[PDB]
Amino acid sequence: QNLKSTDRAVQQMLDKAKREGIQTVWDRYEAMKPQCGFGETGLCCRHCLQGPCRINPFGDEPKVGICGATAEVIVARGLDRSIAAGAAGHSGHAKHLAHTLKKAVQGKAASYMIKDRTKLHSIAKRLGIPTEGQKDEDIALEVAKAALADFHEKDTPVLWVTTVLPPSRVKVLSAHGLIPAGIDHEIAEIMHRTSMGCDADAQNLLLGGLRCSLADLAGCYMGTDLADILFGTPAPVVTESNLGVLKADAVNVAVHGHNPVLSDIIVSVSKEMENEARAAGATGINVVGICCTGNEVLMRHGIPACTHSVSQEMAMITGALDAMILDYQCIQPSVATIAECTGTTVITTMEMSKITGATHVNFAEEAAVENAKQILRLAIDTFKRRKGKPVEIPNIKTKVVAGFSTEAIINALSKLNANDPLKPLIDNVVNGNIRGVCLFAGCNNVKVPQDQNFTTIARKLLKQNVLVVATGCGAGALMRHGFMDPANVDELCGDGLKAVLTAIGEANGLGGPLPPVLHMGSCVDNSRAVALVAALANRLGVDLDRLPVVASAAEAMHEKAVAIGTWAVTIGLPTHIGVLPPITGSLPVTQILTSSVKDITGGYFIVELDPETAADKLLAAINERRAGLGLPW
Amino acid sequence: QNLKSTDRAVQQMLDKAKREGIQTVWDRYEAMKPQCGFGETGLCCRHCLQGPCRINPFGDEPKVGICGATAEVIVARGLDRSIAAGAAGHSGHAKHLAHTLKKAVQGKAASYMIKDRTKLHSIAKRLGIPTEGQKDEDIALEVAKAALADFHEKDTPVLWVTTVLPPSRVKVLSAHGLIPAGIDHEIAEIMHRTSMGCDADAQNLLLGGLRCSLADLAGCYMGTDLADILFGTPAPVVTESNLGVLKADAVNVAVHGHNPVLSDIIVSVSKEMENEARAAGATGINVVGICCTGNEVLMRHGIPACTHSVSQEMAMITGALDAMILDYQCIQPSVATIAECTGTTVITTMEMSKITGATHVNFAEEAAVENAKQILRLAIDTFKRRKGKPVEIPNIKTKVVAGFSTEAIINALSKLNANDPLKPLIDNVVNGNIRGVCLFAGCNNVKVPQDQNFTTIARKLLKQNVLVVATGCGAGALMRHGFMDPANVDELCGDGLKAVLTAIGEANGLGGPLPPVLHMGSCVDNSRAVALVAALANRLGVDLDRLPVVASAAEAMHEKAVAIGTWAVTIGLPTHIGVLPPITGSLPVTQILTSSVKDITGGYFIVELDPETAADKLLAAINERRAGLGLPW
Numbered sequence A, B: 001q002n003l004k005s006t007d008r009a010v011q012q013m014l015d016k017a018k019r020e021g022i023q024t025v026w027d028r029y030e031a032m033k034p035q036c037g038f039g040e041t042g043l044c045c046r047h048c049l050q051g052p053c054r055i056n057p058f059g060d061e062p063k064v065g066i067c068g069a070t071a072e073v074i075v076a077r078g079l080d081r082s083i084a085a086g087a088a089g090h091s092g093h094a095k096h097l098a099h100t101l102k103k104a105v106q107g108k109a110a111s112y113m114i115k116d117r118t119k120l121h122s123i124a125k126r127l128g129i130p131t132e133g134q135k136d137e138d139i140a141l142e143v144a145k146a147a148l149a150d151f152h153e154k155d156t157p158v159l160w161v162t163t164v165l166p167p168s169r170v171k172v173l174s175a176h177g178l179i180p181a182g183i184d185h186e187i188a189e190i191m192h193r194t195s196m197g198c199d200a201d202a203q204n205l206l207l208g209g210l211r212c213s214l215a216d217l218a219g220c221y222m223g224t225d226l227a228d229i230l231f232g233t234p235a236p237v238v239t240e241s242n243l244g245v246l247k248a249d250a251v252n253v254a255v256h257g258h259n260p261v262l263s264d265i266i267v268s269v270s271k272e273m274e275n276e277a278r279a280a281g282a283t284g285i286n287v288v289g290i291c292c293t294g295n296e297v298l299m300r301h302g303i304p305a306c307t308h309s310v311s312q313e314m315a316m317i318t319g320a321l322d323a324m325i326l327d328y329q330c331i332q333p334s335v336a337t338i339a340e341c342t343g344t345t346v347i348t349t350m351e352m353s354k355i356t357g358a359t360h361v362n363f364a365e366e367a368a369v370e371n372a373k374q375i376l377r378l379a380i381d382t383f384k385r386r387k388g389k390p391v392e393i394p395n396i397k398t399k400v401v402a403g404f405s406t407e408a409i410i411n412a413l414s415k416l417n418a419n420d421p422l423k424p425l426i427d428n429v430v431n432g433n434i435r436g437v438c439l440f441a442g443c444n445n446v447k448v449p450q451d452q453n454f455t456t457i458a459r460k461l462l463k464q465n466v467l468v469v470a471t472g473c474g475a476g477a478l479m480r481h482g483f484m485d486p487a488n489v490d491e492l493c494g495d496g497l498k499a500v501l502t503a504i505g506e507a508n509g510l511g512g513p514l515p516p517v518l519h520m521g522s523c524v525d526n527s528r529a530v531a532l533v534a535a536l537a538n539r540l541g542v543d544l545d546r547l548p549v550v551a552s553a554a555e556a557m558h559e560k561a562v563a564i565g566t567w568a569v570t571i572g573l574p575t576h577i578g579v580l581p582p583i584t585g586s587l588p589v590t591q592i593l594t595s596s597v598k599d600i601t602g603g604y605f606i607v608e609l610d611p612e613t614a615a616d617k618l619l620a621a622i623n624e625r626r627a628g629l630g631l632p633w
């Protein structure tokens, strides 16, 4: 089962699923082989009813689509639609939060409030919204209105792009026409331009895709901003991860999906329902996280993470998962059928994300507490139904230190230099104790043995003194393998990196180092990494494409991960992807994305499926940046 | 060549392309056979990087997508993305017009103006915008602002839905949650909900698709409204169609694509450039239409239509097409390579729709006349380059009476009943002289011998006394086969229909009948048919799903045609589609779209590839509606 997942808890549950005859994602993948080579290479188009069209990667006809669309056009159009779909998931998440904040400050949703007043005022100042002599509720109303305005055209571009990147970067992007006019405007323009008989020039199509990827970045940054206002900006917190965080004696409730508008209330209401759970014979309600809504409540409240991404079904296989509470995105719909075998109650809550066979409980922000109690009472009832039934919870968990928002990283560094907090980080980049920075982001993917690329690449980079930060299910992979436990610094980190992590940790009163990898949060919280990198660029007076900073979507899966990788390139970063996106059917498109885009944005994709080789290529990219700054490497 | 097209002019040019070795759309289709059966049935998904996934229509595994997505989910998600893409093309067209009107009345684009003041005031009244004591430019500014506001969420739903359908229909749709909140909002929500791990219930997905199809309707209606304000509401006009409208002695300039913001200015500027063309040795500039921008200038100015849809390359094969001026949508990108063989200068004009190898001349509304002259001077130069070269223009053309906007139809009927113009139409439905109404809409499709379904179905319906109206390339097919020439009424029309067309025509001073088919305009002008049908419903006090009115997208191709067919169903019409959409891989989805949706909206799809059988099924649908009203049939 080591070929399927490198996580021992997942392996144990794969053995249980096999003997119980429960089909998993890995079984459905095996049943799909061999996969279509036209789809794999991007050489398929279904954009009109004359299709499906395909192009042979090599050989004879078909060589061109029925309408005349070339391989370059077909590949670029498919990629652009994936970017638009990712942007749509974001930003839809962000729009939900904006409406929640607006309702909260209008008196329509009293379960929500301004929890982080400092964040609210800082965002207002960033946007140009006046605060002096204004009520907090009025400031927040203007912030929410500004957020909603960024979805459509207006007299300003998308401010959640132009106010979050340094002016010099905005100027580079504007010169190429890449600043988005409105988030949903760009999504629609992509769908238009990629429809039949429209844009048919690869470079033009890809420029459109870069611009739409910045609409995705705006949605990510807006999501982080608004969630921090409503639920609190993360600070360092200690918890645990992996399936061993489930408790046979408790009502185990997974929050799964994406939006803290839902998961944050489940967490608080679950605490009030403790005695109601105890009357049912449980010790209490044990909320655990899956995927990014799990990351949200881990980062803010230390809620333990159960599992992530590709292995999500395995939480159910334990037999101890009483409920799985869903909003949207990254939920394998197989959970609804597996639930019938395991007993778990799967509950959907959002009108636009239902799963046949799963109970639907509308969750309205206006009734959030009451709707949460209805949901948790279904979980309690499910716990009672498994009285006396053995469960198999692998006794496997890691210690996780997390909560490294950009504010928290700056604060930790400020213990070494109070009035110039970024300088200690820069000093150690210059002296070589920190070679560079690598952000691990994105999903697991059934094609890659689970976590193998994240851990293989991270181990090589850490030994070479790279400061590693992580989000999403990349953070999930690293946390489940011990990379967020400071006890593992000696084993994992090069001497220079260990010295820096130790100096920061000891200055923060830990008597020990920061963890080997800094958890910066959910996938929208890739925007936090942007904030950190932009702050470094501004402090140094250079653009982001001169910094020794790289990204790796080492096991990418979702359209959202394609969008994030694309904006990482667009803001100036060398960006590794560890699975094949459907681009190899067009050499011209591949050449643009991996090479000539350097001349547009300074970033570029690094497509590399072998993780050892990917680590070497990421180190070369970091070291090239060091050399460009005149630094030893 | 009769297997490829039923149009003799197209056949002649297919022979020329064959002997000259110029590959056509039909050749590229032949090279594509056999097409992928997974794509044909809808049983393929590429919504994440674990794909491509497929499901065998019948047999053994694969039976389910890797994430667990069932056939029902995969089929519904693909269909929803096609609807969103169609909506994006519209409405993007509409947004362009809204920005043009705004610029015009702000003094920023003096080549544009309020040409139809009556239409402006009527739209303002419909929307609730006050007119008394307001400057026309201020009324128009408010109309343009309202149009742009319908793209995003606000305190009202999309007014280009709720103000254009009768209250009883809006109530039915609202009860099912189908009224769009914002045009681009719905497009983005579709892309979100159909991304991996989101909506996974076929009925829920399809309800979302119906709602997005109404966002498409709003874009269509907005496009017609704004184009009528800017360029004039059509009235009956006489012209010609088919390749014989080209003139060897003139500079032949095709306008191709969609937006009259471009084609209307080409038409007027071409007239000023006559003497500049004559100095180059031409008789003048002969502007001709292709596709819907051709329909726009045909409807408003009587510009002759050269060709449509699938046969567009054949205009170039004549050797006499000096320029082809493009904005966006439905342009085979093959035109850019064919141009090198024929001599034609292909010119793109819109930033988001370029074609490699075609000259790009930005067209800005602020410089429209100057940019038009630059474009036409390239055409003049091209004419000069073909001095002395034989051309082969098939000497084939039909007479076309067109210009039947809903205002024009009402006015024609008012000659029989001045103060109750719809009553003469209703009277003749009741007495059986008019059996019902059928709208032909949409594209040609290379899979269907060109025009064969439109003409076969239309002939059967006309003999059964159906009033036939048409738009887009369905109008194109019918016009090129003589269905818009009143001289053909005796041959084509049943006695009852002939009597009505004759009574209306003679009351309008024609000494003869209206044509066999009424041309209601471009594909956005399917909204005109909605206006007519809604007006009939309101006059009768019944909802649209009780009227003997049907639609037929008999040779559909573009995602826009899928969106239009879907909103035709959503507003209550039996809607034929004459090509297979990618739905047959899921019986549950097919059953919803062809049957159970009757219980939601009263409309339904009729999927039928055999045109004789489709005509019978359309007549049965009309006659069932007649029976429901208590009428003989």
Ligand code: SF4
Residues within 6 Å of the ligand: A045, A046, A047, A048, A049, A050, A051, A052, A053, A065, A066, A067, A068, A069, A074, A195, A196, A197
């Ligand atoms: S858009 Fe072109 S390449 Fe795509 S399915 Fe249609 S004819 Fe084929």
Ligand code: SF4
Residues within 6 Å of the ligand: B045, B046, B047, B048, B049, B050, B051, B052, B053, B065, B066, B067, B068, B069, B074, B195, B196, B197
């Ligand atoms: S969304 Fe599901 S069915 Fe589609 S490609 Fe991904 S794993 Fe396969």
Ligand code: F3S
Residues within 6 Å of the ligand: A291, A292, A308, A309, A310, A329, A330, A441, A442, A443, A444, A471, A472, A473, A474, A523, A557, A558, A560, A561
């Ligand atoms: S929440 Fe989803 S977008 Fe990827 S990072 Fe995890 S599978």
Ligand code: F3S
Residues within 6 Å of the ligand: B291, B292, B308, B309, B310, B329, B330, B441, B442, B443, B444, B471, B472, B473, B474, B523, B557, B558, B560, B561
């Ligand atoms: S303009 Fe296009 S949408 Fe169809 S009706 Fe003609 S091919």
Ligand code: FES
Residues within 6 Å of the ligand: A036, A037, A038, A039, A040, A044, A045, A052, A054, B036, B039, B044, B046, B052
């Ligand atoms: S031919 Fe397999 S993805 Fe289309």
Ligand code: FES
Residues within 6 Å of the ligand: A036, A039, A044, A046, A052, B036, B037, B038, B039, B040, B044, B045, B052, B054
């Ligand atoms: S397997 Fe052919 S359309 Fe995907």
Ligand SMILES: [Fe+3]
Residues within 6 Å of the ligand: A258, A291, A292, A330, A472, A522, A523
């Ligand atoms: Fe996520």
Ligand SMILES: [Fe+3]
Residues within 6 Å of the ligand: B258, B291, B292, B330, B472, B522, B523
């Ligand atoms: Fe059209």
Ligand code: NI
Residues within 6 Å of the ligand: A441, A442, A443, A472, A473, A523, A558, A560, A561
């Ligand atoms: Ni992610």
Ligand code: NI
Residues within 6 Å of the ligand: B441, B442, B443, B472, B473, B523, B558, B560, B561
């Ligand atoms: Ni059309």
